[PDB]
Curated annotation (Swiss-Prot), chain B:
GO CC field: cytosol; GATOR2 complex; kinetochore; lysosomal membrane; nuclear pore outer ring; Seh1-associated complex
UniProt similarity note: Belongs to the WD repeat SEC13 family.
TM regions (residue ranges): none
Notes on how activity is controlled: The GATOR2 complex is negatively regulated by the upstream amino acid sensors CASTOR1 and SESN2, which sequester the GATOR2 complex in absence of amino acids. In the presence of abundant amino acids, GATOR2 is released from CASTOR1 and SESN2 and activated.
Alphabetical UniProt keywords: Cell cycle, Cell division, Centromere, Chromosome, Chromosome partition, Kinetochore, Lysosome, Membrane, Mitosis, mRNA transport, Nuclear pore complex, Nucleus, Protein transport, Repeat, Translocation, Transport, WD repeat
WD repeats: 4-43, 49-86, 97-138, 146-190, 197-234, 248-287
The encoding gene: seh1l-a
GO annotation terms (biological process): attachment of mitotic spindle microtubules to kinetochore; cell division; cellular response to amino acid starvation; cellular response to nutrient levels; mitotic metaphase chromosome alignment; mRNA transport; nuclear pore organization; positive regulation of TORC1 signaling
Record protein name field: Nucleoporin SEH1-A
SUPFAM superfamilies, per database record: WD40 repeat-like
UniProt organism field: Xenopus laevis (African clawed frog)
Cell compartments where the protein resides: Chromosome, Centromere, Kinetochore; Nucleus, Nuclear pore complex; Lysosome membrane
Known function: Component of the Nup107-160 subcomplex of the nuclear pore complex (NPC). The Nup107-160 subcomplex is required for the assembly of a functional NPC. The Nup107-160 subcomplex is also required for normal kinetochore microtubule attachment, mitotic progression and chromosome segregation. This subunit plays a role in recruitment of the Nup107-160 subcomplex to the kinetochore. As a component of the GATOR2 complex, functions as an activator of the amino acid-sensing branch of the mTORC1 signaling pathway. The GATOR2 complex indirectly activates mTORC1 through the inhibition of the GATOR1 subcomplex. GATOR2 probably acts as an E3 ubiquitin-protein ligase toward GATOR1. In the presence of abundant amino acids, the GATOR2 complex mediates ubiquitination of the NPRL2 core component of the GATOR1 complex, leading to GATOR1 inactivation. In the absence of amino acids, GATOR2 is inhibited, activating the GATOR1 complex.
InterPro entries xrefs: G-protein_beta_WD-40_rep, Sec13/Seh1_fam, WD40/YVTN_repeat-like_dom_sf, WD40_repeat_dom_sf, WD40_rpt
UniProt GO MF annotations: structural molecule activity
From Swiss-Prot, chain C:
Keywords for the protein's UniProt record, in alphabetical order: Membrane, mRNA transport, Nuclear pore complex, Nucleus, Protein transport, Translocation, Transport
Ranges that cross the membrane: none
UniProt protein name: Nuclear pore complex protein Nup85
Family the UniProt entry places it in: Belongs to the nucleoporin Nup85 family.
MF terms (GO), sorted A to Z: structural constituent of nuclear pore
Subcellular location per the Swiss-Prot or TrEMBL entry: Nucleus, Nuclear pore complex; Nucleus membrane
UniProt subunit comment: Component of the nuclear pore complex (NPC).
Keyword Nuclease among UniProt keywords: no
Length: 292, 293, 519, 158
């Protein structure tokens, strides 16, 4: 677990599309908001992105392109031409209030706010806009269905496929205690979903099998942070908490959850792990690159 | 960046965060600055507040909202609220009651509610409250007390209430110092004590944040700097000591300001020097350093 | 003329100046922070991390309770500090094609590392001297010196070998046997009446000459290594460093070293202040000294007070780096109210997390949260939701006014939020729409309180009665009259046909009640 | 060819998660597809790429199947499952044997074509992997010997 001081409170981390070796990172909360591509693995600051605007959305828009969403709900994307070390800023929209999470449905980069502005693949005009005010859960349950989850943790399946502006369905806990921080939707089947309770609970979900709260928990300490999951072992996953904490809940094992990570630090940035981070609720600086 | 005021700038004030600045001048306009995240102060808005020169300005606590109060030689105080949608600031109300040109206006501490004081050539300190927080136009006149005639400055005790009682220092002319407190349920201001040994005209006075200290500190910029220590103890329940005097300005001390914590005092004067002060372990003040211009 | 305002900004009122040189033209003046630089951030951040580690380890060890482990644990922390100093040294030259800055800072860091080594040695003397020689090194006759220097830190040729053997026969011994061993070697040298051979004889004159050619510290290390490995009296050694150093003649650093040898620690602190760095690191060192202050010293008790001052100084030094602020609060426990107030002044998710941390460890922070929600409202719904949530955590009346206005002018969201009397009434109305318990709850909500559209609610109640037939309302007709009186009062303070219709509708309920009575 | 192979490995875990009977059938189908590929074995470069794909995760999958087989001998029968499971085991046995004779000629030719470098790495990296990791296959062979059901035993001895 080779740590590395960026001396920069990290907000983003991607095992890039190209194992978890091409790291990229977006550093919010600095006087000229930061992001670096090819850093570091070894200095390798090939694209330490000099950038106004911060990182709300973020996506490796190709293996040589990078999508992102900017601080005021603006939009920001370039094409990571790693050969010649320059790039071209692809997407720059003004007023898509920031965005609260980031979803995908290829290649319409869907998202949610804390209003929806469906830009898409080369859709430099804002095509779909089901402008429904949200009182941070965002994904593709099936193309192009989604489920907006307001800060009552209040999930509601809507779409952008057919017309309409309501939601089609709604997932909800009995008490709506926590706010919209961290939900889960399984790659084992895109109709399988969970969530993490900001008390330190789970909140597992059944789409077909009713709509009940399947599995809570009581394991972590703080708000639900983010979960490292294996990108091919769906079951293998480990849990975390909003100090940056991490309890290894060996879920390909059966509750085998321990003091996992190089712990006790401040928070963690954003999640992508394949072959890595599981970013916390508060996004500070940390690193380890030994994810096998 | 040039203030953008044609006439001379009387006062500058920071918001709660310290990100925004308000200015007022004799050009009758109030300017609000934004400290951009890119570090340059840019003015947010400027408007013609009053008919006559605007001496003083202040910001209310951010819980109430974005409110700035202003003070003029036109004998009025105005309350303004920032409109996000914008002309940027709208008049909430006008206070006509002062029969003469007003020197100063200050919001009270946040715990008290929307409350402000003002002092004028009439020499009558007035306190206004907003009894409904919802009605920012509903400003009642809470109290009126008499002082003397000439110079004026006000400075509330910023002590959080629950821990301490409200009191306010008024510095007019002088070397004479006048101090006032609040009574139990008389609900009237009484003169607990006075700050003695005041020298020349009291250009400025400020009360220091009493964070982690039982005693209270007030500094006056006369044409000398003084620091007074107030201690209540327990009819009467007040005592002052004079901590220090400082003449290294050699001239008028126009401004005295405190740190957010009350750790640092600052003083400025006709030498064109700004001095920062720390308290010793002995509770004597020492000059840390001097900025010049 | 100077006008200064804390945010910091300095501006000048129109005046001759002062000076102005070359020229002063109402130029914007930026006044602020001791803390600076990009890499500076790394070093400051690293220092903060080290402080955090120190806080983390010692307390845990104490929880473990008394052990030698504590003696070794302290040594490990010192080693970590040395490693950090090495990293700082590495960072520097890493500066590339460029100017000159922080070179002096790195020199100061090296001096501090040397001081920490001395402190660890104080917390064996021969090993310490060897380590000092090594640190000095890190910071023909020359070949002979190299041959010796390394040894000390752990026919002519034959004569030199013999001299070396004689030197060996002294280190081995009984110090009395070494005294006699040196004398014999000196006698042999006298008989010899070549320079290398004399050096091998030693005993011990040349080392001083070498120091004169140089350094006094090196000479002292040599003395610890090859003469007698007891270090007790430093007057003579001090004179040698003082005189040998003068002969050799950075001067300020030498003076600081002399002060350290005096043992300070007040003088050392003064020297650090004169250097002005590291400030926070120096404060940490002072805190460590206070922790150590084991040996029954009144000065140490005063020393403890000085250490307490240092933490306050560190807090003053801290400015805006959130993790650093948290570390400072932790140091203070071992500020709270200002921190939260400062966060409120700064004025979102990260701020909320900080507030939660403060709660775990307040009112001002809550007020700041309320102000932020109000600003959001100025989002026109989500700001109210957020602010309302903050209020619930501990404005509510205002939220009720807004929600009630919205429900007169979303419904599911309102129901979820409710899951207050007005909200209950709205729920009852919803139940009535769904299609008696709901209608009853709506009327109880009305009797508790009233609403300005209120007329619409009354109409809805009348509709419910019509659906029901108003058998048991009886009170409502009496209740209705009171409402009418209230309306009249409102009119006095400040649709007639419509008002008549409501009365007719009410009459129907009374008729239904009469029919029920007949039944 | 890419779509089916990718689906099949994923399904095998997917098959295991839901319906043992239906997962097993999918695995059998995958084995049949592998057999078809073996029978089948610019264009030369594509073939080399296919060989590289054949030679770490894929190797592990065979090991996992062997582990299932080791589990399998102790319990179940389940002949329909056994046929499909048995068929899959036979395919795994055969592919390595059939592949190896083809592979040595094939891999050297691929290296010659490269004079591609990554594919050559498969020749290097793939070769290191092959030795195993022997035990899991060996345990399955032992189980087959214990069973004395014939077949499986031939592929195991070969």
């Amino acid at each position: 677990f080779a740590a590395k001081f960026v001396s920069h409170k990290i907000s983003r981390t991607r095992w890039r599309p190209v194992q978890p070796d091409v790291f990229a990172t977006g550093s919010w909360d600095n006087e000229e908001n930061k992001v670096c591509v090819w850093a570091t693995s070894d200095p390798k600051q090939l694209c330490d992105i000099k950038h106004p605007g911060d990182v709300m959305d973020m996506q490796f828009l190709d293996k040589e392109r990078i999508v992102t969403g900017s601080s005021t709900g603006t939009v920001t994307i370039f094409r990571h031409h790693e050969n010649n070390q320059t790039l071209s800023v692809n997407q720059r929209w003004e007023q898509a209030a920031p965005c609260t999470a980031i979803v995908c449905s290829s290649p319409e980069i869907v998202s949610v706010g804390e209003r929806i502005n469906c830009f898409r693949a080369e859709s430099r005009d804002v095509l779909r806009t089901i402008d429904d005010a949200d009182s941070h859960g965002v994904t593709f349950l099936r193309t192009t269905e989604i489920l907006t989850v307001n800060s009552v943790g209040q999930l509601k399946l809507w779409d952008l496929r057919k017309q309409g502006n309501d939601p089609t369905q709604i997932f909800s806990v009995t008490g709506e205690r926590v706010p919209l921080h961290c939900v889960d939707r399984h790659p084992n089947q895109q109709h399988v979903v969970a969530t993490g309770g900001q008390d330190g609970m789970l909140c597992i979900w059944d789409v077909r099998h009713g709509k009940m709260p399947m599995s809570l928990l009581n394991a972590h300490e703080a708000e639900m942070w983010e979960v490292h999951f294996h990108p091919s072992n769906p079951d293998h996953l480990f849990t975390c908490s909003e100090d940056g904490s991490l309890w290894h809940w060996d879920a390909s094992a059966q509750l085998e959850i321990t003091n996992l990570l190089p712990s006790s630090t401040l928070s963690v940035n954003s999640l992508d792990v394949l072959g890595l981070v599981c970013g916390t609720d508060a996004e500070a600086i940390y690193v380890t690159r030994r994810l096998f | 960046i040039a203030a953008d005021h044609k006439d001379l700038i009387h006062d500058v004030s920071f918001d709660f965060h310290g990100r925004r600045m308000a200015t007022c001048s004799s050009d009758q306009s109030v300017k609000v600055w934004d400290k951009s995240e890119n570090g340059n102060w840019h003015c947010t808005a400027s408007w013609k507040t009053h008919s006559g020169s605007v001496w003083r300005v202040t910001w209310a606590h951010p819980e109430f909202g974005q409110v700035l109060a202003s003070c003029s030689f036109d004998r009025t105080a105005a309350v303004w609220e920032e409109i996000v949608g914008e002309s940027h600031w709208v008049k909430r109300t006008t206070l006509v009651d002062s029969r003469t040109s007003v020197t100063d206006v200050k919001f009270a501490p946040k715990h008290m509610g929307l409350m402000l004081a003002t002092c004028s050539a009439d020499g009558v300190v007035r306190i206004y409250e907003a009894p409904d927080v919802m009605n920012l136009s509903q400003w009642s006149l809470q109290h009126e007390i008499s002082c003397k005639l000439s110079c004026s400055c006000i400075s509330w005790n910023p002590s959080s209430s629950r821990a301490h009682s409200p009191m306010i220092a008024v510095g007019s002319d002088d070397g004479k110092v006048q101090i006032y407190e609040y009574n139990e349920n008389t609900r009237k201001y009484a003169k607990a004590e006075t700050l003695m040994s005041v020298s020349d005209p009291v250009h400025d006075i400020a009360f220091a944040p009493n964070l982690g200290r039982s005693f209270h500190i007030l500094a006056v910029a006369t044409k000398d700097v003084r620091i007074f220590t107030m201690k209540p103890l327990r009819v009467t329940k007040f005592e002052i000591h004079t901590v220090a005097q400082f003449d290294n300005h050699n001239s008028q001390v126009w401004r005295v300001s405190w740190n957010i914590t009350g750790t640092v005092l600052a003083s400025s004067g006709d030498d064109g020097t700004v001095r920062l002060w720390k308290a010793n372990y002995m509770d004597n003040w020492k000059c840390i350093g001097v900025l010049k211009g | 003329h100077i006008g200064f305002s804390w945010g910091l900004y300095e501006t000048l009122y129109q005046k001759q100046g002062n000076s102005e040189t070359a020229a002063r033209c109402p130029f914007m003046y930026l006044v602020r922070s001791d803390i600076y630089s990009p890499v500076l951030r790394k070093l400051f951040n690293e220092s903060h991390s080290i402080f955090v580690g120190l806080q983390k380890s010692a307390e845990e060890a104490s929880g473990k309770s008394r052990k030698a482990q504590l003696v070794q644990v302290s040594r490990n922390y010192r080693s970590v500090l040395r490693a950090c100093m090495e990293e700082m040294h590495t960072l520097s030259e890493s500066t590339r094609e460029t100017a000159q800055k922080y070179i002096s800072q790195i020199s100061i860091l090296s001096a501090m590392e040397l001081s920490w080594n001395l402190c660890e040695i104080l917390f064996p003397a021969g090993p310490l001297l060897i380590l000092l020689l090594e640190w000095v090194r890190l910071h023909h006759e020359k070949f002979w010196d190299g041959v010796t220097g390394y040894v000390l830190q752990g026919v002519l040729d034959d004569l030199l070998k013999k001299m070396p053997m004689l030197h060996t026969g002294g280190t081995q011994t009984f110090e009395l046997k070494w005294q006699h061993w040196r004398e014999e070697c000196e006698r042999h040298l006298q008989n010899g009446t070549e320079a290398v051979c004399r050096v091998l004889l030693g005993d011990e004159e040349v080392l001083l000459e070498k120091r004169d050619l140089m350094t006094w510290y090196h000479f002292l290390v040599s003395r610890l290594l090859f003469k007698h490995p007891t270090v007790k009296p430093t007057e003579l050694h001090f004179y040698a460093q003082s005189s040998l150093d003068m002969f050799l003649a950075p001067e300020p650093l030498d003076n600081i070293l002399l002060a350290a040898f005096e043992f300070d620690i007040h003088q050392v602190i003064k020297e650090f202040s004169i250097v002005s760095s590291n400030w926070w690191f120096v404060a940490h060192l002072t805190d460590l000294l206070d922790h150590c202050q084991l040996f029954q010293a009144h000065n140490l008790y005063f020393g403890a007070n000085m250490r307490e001052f240092l933490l306050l100084d560190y807090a003053s030094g801290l400015f805006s780096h959130h993790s650093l602020w948290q570390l400072g609060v932790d140091y203070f426990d071992y500020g709270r109210e200002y921190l939260k107030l400062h966060m409120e002044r700064i004025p979102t998710e990260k701020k909320a997390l900080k507030a939660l941390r403060i709660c775990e460890q307040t009112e001002q922070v809550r007020s700041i949260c309320k102000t932020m929600a109000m600003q959001s409202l100025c989002r026109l719904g989500s700001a109210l939701s957020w602010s309302i949530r903050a209020k619930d955590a501990a404005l509510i009346s205002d939220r009720f006014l807004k929600e009630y206005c919205e429900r007169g002018n979303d419904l599911i969201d309102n129901l979820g939020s409710a899951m207050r009397l007005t909200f209950l009434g709205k729920y009852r109305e919803f139940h009535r729409m769904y299609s008696f318990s709901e209608a009853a709850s709506l009327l109880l909500s009305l009797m508790t309180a009233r609403i300005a559209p209120c007329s619409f609610w009354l109409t809805l109640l009348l509709d419910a009665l019509p659906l029901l037939e108003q058998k048991q309302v009886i009170f409502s007709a009496e209740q209705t009259y009171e409402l009418m009186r209230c309306l009249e009062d409102r009119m006095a303070a400040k649709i007639q046909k419509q008002d008549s219709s409501i009365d007719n509708t009410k009459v129907e309920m009374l008729r239904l009640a009469l029919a029920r009575n007949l039944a | 060819l890419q779509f089916l192979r990718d689906t099949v490995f994923l399904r095998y875990r997917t098959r295991a998660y839901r319906r043992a009977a239906e997962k097993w059938e999918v695995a059998e189908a995958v084995l049949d597809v592998f057999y078809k590929l073996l029978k089948d074995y610019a264009f030369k470069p594509p073939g080399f790429s296919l060989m590289h794909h054949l030679l770490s995760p894929m190797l592990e999958l065979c090991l996992s199947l062997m582990e299932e087989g080791v589990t399998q001998l102790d319990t179940y029968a389940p002949f329909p499952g056994k046929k499909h499971l048995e068929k899959a085991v036979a395919y795994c046995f055969m592919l390595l044997n059939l592949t190896l004779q083809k592979e040595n000629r094939f891999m050297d030719l691929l290296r010659e074509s490269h004079l591609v470098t990554p594919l050559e790495q498969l020749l290097q990296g793939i070769n290191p992997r092959s030795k195993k990791a022997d035990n899991v296959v060996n345990i399955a062979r032992y189980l087959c010997h214990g069973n004395s059901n014939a077949e499986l035993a031939f592929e195991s001895a070969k």
